Design a protein around this ligand. Structure first.
Ligand SMILES: C[C@@H]1C[C@@H]([C@H](O)CC2CC(=O)NC(=O)C2)C(=O)[C@@H](C)C1
Lengths: 144, 125, 204
RNA sequence: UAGUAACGGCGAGUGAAACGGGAAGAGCCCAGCGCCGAAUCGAUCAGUCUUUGGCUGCUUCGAAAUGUGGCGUAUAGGUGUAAGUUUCCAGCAGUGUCGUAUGUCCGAAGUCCUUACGAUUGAGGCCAUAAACCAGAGAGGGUGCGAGCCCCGUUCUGGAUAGCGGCACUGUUGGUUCGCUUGCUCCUUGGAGUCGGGUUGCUUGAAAGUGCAGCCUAAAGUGGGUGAUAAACUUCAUCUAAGGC
RNA sequence: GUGAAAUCGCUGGAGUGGAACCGGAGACAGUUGAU
RNA sequence: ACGUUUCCGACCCGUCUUGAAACACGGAUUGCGGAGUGCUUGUCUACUGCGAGUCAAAGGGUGUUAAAACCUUGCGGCGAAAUGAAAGUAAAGGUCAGUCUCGAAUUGGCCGACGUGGGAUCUGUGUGUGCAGCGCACCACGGCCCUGUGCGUGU
RNA sequence: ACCAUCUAGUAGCUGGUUCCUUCCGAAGUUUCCCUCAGGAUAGCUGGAUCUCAGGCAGUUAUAUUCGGUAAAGCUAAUGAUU
RNA sequence: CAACGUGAAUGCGAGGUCCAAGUGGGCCAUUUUUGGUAAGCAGAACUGGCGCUGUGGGAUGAACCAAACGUGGAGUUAAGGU
RNA sequence: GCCGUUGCGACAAGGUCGUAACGAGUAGGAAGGUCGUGGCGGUUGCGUUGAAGGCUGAGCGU
RNA sequence: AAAGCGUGGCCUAUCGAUCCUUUUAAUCCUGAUUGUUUCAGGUAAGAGGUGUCAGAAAAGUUACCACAGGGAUAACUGGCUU
């Protein structure tokens, strides 16, 4: 939208909104993130603390698929149960949730669980998740 | 959930909840009471649950006729400061006692975590 | 000269990038060309399936994907033997053979054997000479319903089923899942140290 | 995947891959071992054909035992045996079936009345309720700026014709086929100044060396390589380098 | 084809003492409107 | 009104500069051309759609006013969980009552996203104003929960 | 040397940077920088607005405090000095 | 929890967040003040100005005295004058 | 007296009107522009009885 | 004896980032085909030093000289001072 840009309203004013003293001039401070330790030090330290230096172990060819471990909280478990399965879960029968098929590998215990006990099948459980599920009356089943 | 909490308070059972924010569905909410809500936009899930629980959804023009002066209303809105952008507002990240979120390309040990963030490298604010 | 709170720039444009530019204005043209190539191939090889050879079922390699199956390169020789199909015969009746893959598990072998069996059930074989049929060749009125198949041969279904609700058993509840997981981790982590201790104890 | 792992006066900057979803999909041949062992091949001569090249030989020469050909290559392979099962190439002529950025030929309807103009294609009218007429053609160009209807053209998932092709079937000609699969049986099975190592230089995201090369050193045979932090000693897993399409 | 500005020539009017131009306010000349 | 004549005012523009009419620089005249753009990546703001989701890629299917439009995703991007170098671990308490080996214990109900102060509005009730109640957003002061780490125990 | 290309080489430096009205309206100061013709940083400035409907003020009064300059002193310490 | 009820003058609505420009050569004056014999010299403090600003006056002038500006009119004046 | 800005207000209106105060400005920032230019998707019309372009009287708008 | 006092010097100066090296610390974490031991890499705290002290690795000459600028800056005139 060139019609709405500042250049449209700056026609006729000599400096184009860049001043008569300072002037718009190429690269007056350097190119890129240069000088982060000498003359841009205040900006770098104020807005990007921790920038310079190096910390931690270094992994040659990290394997991200090993550490891939999506998680789900116990408070979201019931929403994963489809309505038809909820209808079928009657007479003490608890719905069975296979988190691996839904894409979650670990179950974390944040929030509260519904009245209906649930059977939860996941590769990993947190201690609080296990305690809350069992206290609500369901069971935790470990799958490979 | 906020609508449900508002209506479940002593005296608010039969009041009309007025909000100009979008009403979204909460997966963590298990029981939905009877809610009478006047709103601009209500998502499909929230609308279905409210109507299933015996509630009613009206528009602002309909509220103008029901309560022209705003009688028996409960005015609500969403959390205005609960935005990702707001987390980046405040004192600069590199200032003492500042918990502002920096603008980092990525998250990891190699991304602004060494000098000025731990006493092992120069200092820590 | 960055000013104020900004994300530090990262644009990789310091090379003479103007000499290596690739646009995608020919995307619909490529789509049309590939459709026309498929049509020409279908005309050429009718009534054989346009897709071509039949591919095998395969589990995705890593544990991030091992709960999903997909089309493989071909059928292993063990699977062909289990289905009673010669490799030479498979090449003729249009079944892909993966000469590198071998089966180490009965379930994986059986899935592909069943796939081969259903493909053979669905196969229609024309007589080698139209005048004189032979044994194995499909029957006359079977050869009339023959139609070219489009898309993958025996496409895979990716629908997700939900286990039926059941009763929570008492033995299930009495298990200590977190303690079990931590015990397994500890046992794997300390396996070697305990072996060293056992060897030293034996030597003493 | 990902501006990620990693590299970098760890500064400025640089920077992949596997898994995953797709397009397309096609597999094979040697050396060596072993068997037949010259069963192989080039020129030339003479016949013969559909001759810008092919087929036949007591033609004559030559290549080839320092080994041409046949079987055979990691999925192995071979011997014998029992079951099953058993052709394939190339041209020629026809019969149809179908494409052609292939030539040539062919096409619906006003130059109607009035008016305007230097010149109309401009303006108005052309039975009829719905009406000048054609329209599967109202793309484009030309014609005295303006045109579906004046012309070339345009539409007919256009026709006719000749030529090129691709197919499918018939006949014919020449060559060729003791084979192929599965079980059992016994036998058998592989690339060296290369790999690897030291050092030097370049190169890479490749980090106690990713790739390449010089010089020195220089292998082995369940050996060799690889598993991304170097080394011994151990669990294994996975391929088979130094030949080719 | 059209045929701008700068620059230039003619005819008529008017000004013209070491710049010329310009803003404000009238006058003159002139232009224009008046059921 | 770009004619003449009078009265008053009246230094040449652009630019750098503390300061330009300057004995500072560019400018003889006229026409035409002539300078904050493209793209990648960020961030904020405004608007639109949907909303714990959203957008879907390459691709595929169909489309002959066919580079369009229309349909189409176990899978991918961002978001829904953080924290540590890493191994890894990973976010529910409030209140009332008990037992007690009176403790860095234990049990059970009820409630369930914490407490207090201020809070537009809303509700009740007096008389523009007051009092009382429920309190959005937000602010202030605290409390708990997850993770890393120092101290420090035991059951 | 010359010719073409890399090459529109880079320039903290010089020059230019094209319509009209309306409203608001500065700075030449602090800190760091091989920094001193330049930057980053705070300040000064504009815009978007949002939450509310009495606590503020380049001014006084009351109360209470801080100071060692003008004046004063050296017939009070220090230092001169008739 | 109970009660008490706004406790100097004058003026006046108050607070919050975000995004960003230009600037980072200054100069002058009353008063104070350092270097210098002095300087239209160099360096500081408070305030006001010029820069960015025209207007009446000082014959003329960035800063002096008066006074700050939409566009017109009547009246009255400031500094300055007759 | 008139123009505009700002604040407030009335009116069934992206508008009109009322009212009080106000109006300096470089660098710079915003707003409005039935100010101007060239395309595109649409819409409204004019044209050899004379378009674009060019020269220049009566007006309109700060 | 106690109340008490003591985290260096009665107070105001006496000093040092990133990267790398090195040391001390845990009966610590990692080397991703399974383990053991070396070796290497990490987490925490010090030291090795940048005196241009917010921290480049650095000798001259040009009268053979060049470019971008500067009246921010010297040499001649003019100005203030004497
Ligand atoms: C501690 C001190 C400094 C250190 C070293 O030289 C400093 C580094 C700093 C840097 O970031 N890059 C470098 O190339 C040098 C060193 O070995 C000695 C002189 C002593």
């Amino acid at each position: 939208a060139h019609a709405l840009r500042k250049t449209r309203k700056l026609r006729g004013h000599v400096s184009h909104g860049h001043g008569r003293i300072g002037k718009h001039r190429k690269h007056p401070g350097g190119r890129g993130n240069a000088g982060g330790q000498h003359h841009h030090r205040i900006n770098r330290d104020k807005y990007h603390p921790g920038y310079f230096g190096k910390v931690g172990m270094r992994v040659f060819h990290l394997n991200k698929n090993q550490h891939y471990c999506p998680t789900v909280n116990v408070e979201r478990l019931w929403s994963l149960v489809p309505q038809e399965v909820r209808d079928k879960a009657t007479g003490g029968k608890s719905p069975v949730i296979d988190c691996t098929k839904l894409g979650y590998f670990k179950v974390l215990g944040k929030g509260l669980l519904p009245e209906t006990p649930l059977i939860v099948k996941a590769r990993f459980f947190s201690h609080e998740a296990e305690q809350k599920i069992k206290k609500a009356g369901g069971a935790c089943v470990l799958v490979a | 959930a906020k609508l449900a909490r508002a209506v479940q308070k002593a005296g608010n059972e039969n009041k009309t909840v007025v909000t100009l924010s979008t009403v979204t569905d909460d997966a963590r909410l298990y029981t939905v009471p009877k809610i009478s809500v006047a709103a601009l936009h209500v998502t499909e899930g929230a609308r279905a649950r409210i109507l299933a629980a015996g509630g009613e959804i009206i528009t602002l023009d309909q509220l103008a006729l029901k309560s022209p002066k705003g009688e028996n209303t409960v005015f609500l809105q969403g959390p205005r400061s609960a935005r990702e952008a707001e987390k980046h507002f405040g004192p600069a990240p590199g200032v003492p006692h500042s918990h502002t979120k920096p603008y980092v390309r990525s998250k990891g040990r190699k991304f602004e975590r060494a000098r000025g963030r731990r006493a092992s490298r120069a200092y820590k604010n | 000269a960055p000013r104020g709170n900004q994300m530090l720039g990262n644009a990789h444009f310091r090379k003479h990038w103007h000499k290596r530019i690739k646009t995608w204005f020919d995307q619909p043209a490529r789509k049309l060309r590939r459709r026309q190539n498929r049509q020409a191939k279908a005309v050429e090889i009718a009534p054989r399936p346009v897709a071509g050879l039949l591919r095998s079922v395969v589990r995705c390699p890593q544990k991030r994907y091992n709960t999903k199956t997909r089309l493989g390169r071909g059928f292993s020789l063990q699977e062909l033997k289990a289905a009673g199909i010669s490799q030479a015969q498979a090449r003729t009746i249009g079944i892909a053979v993966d000469v590198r893959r071998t089966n180490k598990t009965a379930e994986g072998l059986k899935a592909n054997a069943d796939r081969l069996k259903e493909y053979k059930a669905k196969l229609i074989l024309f007589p080698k000479k139209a005048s004189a049929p032979k044994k194995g060749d499909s029957s006359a009125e079977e050869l009339k319903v023959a139609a070219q198949l489009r898309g993958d041969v025996l496409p895979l279904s990716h629908t997700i089923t939900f286990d039926e609700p059941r009763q929570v058993t008492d033995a299930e509840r009495k298990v200590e899942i977190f303690r079990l997981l931590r015990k397994e981790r500890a046992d794997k982590k300390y396996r070697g140290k305990r072996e060293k201790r056992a060897r030293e104890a034996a030597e003493e």
